């Protein structure tokens, strides 16, 4: 076939598997020793720049996927058992549970302008500025239906701490930053206060907390630890409040300082921290959902109890 | 003026997989490949942050750390991130280190207490191993008992029942009082018993089977609902329907038991595993 | 102070000046990684296409069944689409007791427990 004649004649992909005899004779450690010298360096010595100086600069930076890049992060190390669970059993139950049948020839719904315009016979309406968002001061995202093309999933988790007393005892901020480190496996970024309150002895623009964001597989692993190993150990725990939700599919709740040390990563070396310095955290679970009821329906699929309050 | 179609309502009761699927030969090699790049890019491990000097935990950590040749990790073999030979991070083909069997073996050998309460190393013969995990394939898997729910723990099992003979799912006519969702519950209880912790997903049917009429003989419009079993076993004693036997079958075994047309209608409901 | 110094050392090791540097590959080593990356992203495509194929096939089975249900009459003296209009209700779907916590809490595991399944469960 002429089309197949345009493909590369010599294909590495269509080569036979390596020979066992060749495998036996391939010893990378014996080459460096037998050489008894240092092989000359290659003339290609491009190294990613430390700064991005524009799209037209002679020296350009590679993408993060490039292993030599400065922002490269080693890929997945395992499959979070809660992501395989959700995609294996709970992906179709939520799709089947919440399903509305659309007839075959249903006309596509046309979205109406959310920033209305004035229409009428008054000459003033012509050049009037678009009206304000009706209801809330900011337009809320419209809920999408749970389809086979839109399955709510967990996206990222933000663990934040606020230590006001750390302004007087600087060590309260050092411990808080370490607990949030072992808990999530990343380096928290210090935050600062934004208001001034003398009654609470709060001064503005001073480091008073820390925050980490875990994405991808890390966020699915953290959820499992929280659901199956931390929350089941909180004494007299009722469940996540049914009122949680910002109206966009994100669930927020907080842990006590005595419940933060239940994390296996914090109870192992609990004695290495000064007494009464482990803080409480604010866990914000951001999902792909677009509603409060969808997120609460998503978390219930992962084994989160919710109580009325 | 008799109705042409006889509306029925069934229930496709399923037991989800209880185990994670086996990792492909490439998924294992890839994870191991990335675990060694993490060794070259992550900060070193500070034992002083978890173990305090001259304790039962510190001494136990130092002994086993020397057997691993300084590598604090237990599932990446022997690799030094720094030094002249750091480049040799890749593993040759046909290796055992990257497999998951060797991973679990090393993580278990590192959990046994190697230092007595007094700080002395325990004799090699006096060291008690740790209880190993249970096997993936249970006894029912070896025996092949289809009436068991602990069989094929990595696959979905479907409840199929024989009626005085043709195999099918628990079905029954829909009365005028009950809907599809509340009829599928009454039939499952009158066919397989009430000792099953089942959850009917919802009201929406996941599949349907239509047997046209014979111009006459009344046709049947069977609508199936999805059921999820969490505990118990089916019991066919004192059943109202003329049911004889039952068996929990996989997706590949269903097509060998159910009819071709009956299977072609419910296959769309099947899942990956 | 001693314990806080330990915590500070943990951070001193994570500073940009202490963390290891970016990797430095040759050509054959870089090309070796280029394929492992090219084959992994393609593997995810094969798993993404398969996963999205099952979701579409399971979804089409519902559309077909519900479409048939819409045009049914019965059982008995019930207008067309009664069962359909009753099946599209979402009563309790978005409540607190929607999904049983015994089914959602049980996640997949590499190896089973001492008792994989409990057959002696009684109502």
């Amino acid at each position: 076939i002429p089309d197949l004649a345009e493909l590369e004649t010599r294909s590495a992909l269509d080569a036979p598997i390596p020979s066992e005899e060749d495998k036996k004779e391939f010893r990378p450690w014996k080459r460096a020793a037998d050489r008894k010298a240092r092989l000359p360096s290659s003339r290609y010595q491009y190294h990613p720049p430390k700064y991005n100086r524009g799209p037209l600069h002679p020296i350009q930076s590679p993408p993060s996927s490039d292993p030599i890049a400065r922002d490269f992060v080693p890929g997945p190390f395992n499959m979070p058992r809660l992501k395989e669970t959700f995609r294996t059993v709970m992906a179709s139950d939520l799709m089947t549970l919440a399903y509305i049948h659309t007839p075959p020839g249903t006309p596509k719904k046309e979205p109406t302008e959310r920033l209305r315009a004035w229409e009428g016979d008054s000459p003033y309406f012509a050049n009037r500025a678009r009206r304000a968002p009706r209801g809330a001061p900011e337009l809320p995202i419209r809920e999408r239906d749970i389809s086979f093309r839109n399955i709510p999933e967990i996206k990222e988790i933000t663990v934040s701490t606020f230590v006001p007393l750390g302004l007087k005892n600087p060590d309260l901020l050092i411990v808080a930053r370490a607990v949030l480190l072992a808990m999530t496996g990343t380096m928290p970024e210090m935050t600062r206060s934004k208001n001034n309150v003398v009654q609470w002895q709060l001064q503005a623009n001073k480091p008073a907390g820390c925050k980490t964001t875990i994405y991808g597989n890390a966020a699915w692993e953290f959820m499992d630890r929280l659901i199956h190993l931390v929350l089941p150990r909180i004494k007299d725990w009722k469940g996540v409040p049914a009122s949680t939700g910002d109206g966009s599919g994100n669930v927020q709740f907080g842990l006590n300082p005595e419940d933060v040390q239940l994390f296996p990563e914090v109870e192992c070396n609990y004695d290495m921290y000064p007494a009464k310095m482990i803080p409480g955290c604010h866990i914000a679970i951001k999902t792909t959902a677009t509603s409060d009821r969808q997120a609460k329906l998503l978390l219930q699929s992962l084994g989160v109890p919710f109580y009325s309050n | 003026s008799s109705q042409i179609y006889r509306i029925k309502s069934g229930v496709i009761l399923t037991r989800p997989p209880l185990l994670t699927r086996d990792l492909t030969p490439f998924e294992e090699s890839f994870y191991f490949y990335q675990k060694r790049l993490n060794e070259r890019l992550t900060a070193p491990f500070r034992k002083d942050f978890y173990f305090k000097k001259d304790t039962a935990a510190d001494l136990d950590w130092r002994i086993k750390l020397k057997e691993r040749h300084g590598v604090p990790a237990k599932d990446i073999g022997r690799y030094n991130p720094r030094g002249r030979m750091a480049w040799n991070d890749e593993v040759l083909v046909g290796s055992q280190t990257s497999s998951r069997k060797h991973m679990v073996e090393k993580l278990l050998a590192d959990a046994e207490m190697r230092v007595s309460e007094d700080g002395e190393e325990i004799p090699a013969e006096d060291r008690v191993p740790v209880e190993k995990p249970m096997p993936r394939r249970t006894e029912a898997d070896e025996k092949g008992d289809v009436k068991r729910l602990d069989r094929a723990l990595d696959k979905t099992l479907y409840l199929v029942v024989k009626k005085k003979a043709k195999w099918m799912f628990p079905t029954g006519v829909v009365p005028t009082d009950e809907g599809l969702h509340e009829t599928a519950a009454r039939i499952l209880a009158e066919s397989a018993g009430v000792n099953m912790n089942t959850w009917i997903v919802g009201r929406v049917p996941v599949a349907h089977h239509v047997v046209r009429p014979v111009f006459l003989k009344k046709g049947e419009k069977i609508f199936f609902l999805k059921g999820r079993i969490m505990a118990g076993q089916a019991d066919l004693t004192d059943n109202l329907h003329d049911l004889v036997d039952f068996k929990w079958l996989t997706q590949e075994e269903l097509r060998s038991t159910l009819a071709e047309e009956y299977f072609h209608s419910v296959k769309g409901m099947f899942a990956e595993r | 102070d001693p314990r806080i110094i330990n915590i500070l050392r943990h951070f001193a090791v994570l500073s940009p000046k202490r963390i290891p540097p970016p990797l430095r590959f040759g050509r054959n080593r870089y090309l070796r990684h280029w394929t492992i990356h090219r084959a992994w992203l393609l593997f995810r495509r094969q798993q993404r296409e398969q996963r999205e194929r099952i979701l579409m096939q399971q979804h089409q089975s519902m559309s077909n069944a519900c479409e048939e249900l819409r045009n049914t009459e019965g059982p008995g003296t019930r207008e067309t689409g009664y069962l359909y209009r009753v099946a599209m209700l979402k009563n309790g779907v978005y409540g607190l007791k929607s999904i049983p916590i015994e089914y959602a809490s049980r996640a997949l595991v590499e190896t089973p427990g001492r008792q994989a399944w409990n057959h002696e469960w009684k109502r």
Binding site: R70, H228 | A43, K74, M134 | -
Partner: peptide, 26 residues
């Protein structure tokens, strides 16, 4: 001139988690 930051990640292990049920995951 936008600085290209680097990721600062600590050392991580692989752990076997054995639940009360006797089941184990990594």
């Amino acid at each position: 001139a936008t600085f290209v930051p680097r990721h600062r990640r600590p050392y991580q292990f692989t752990q076997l988690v054995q639940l009360s049920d006797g089941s184990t995951f990594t």
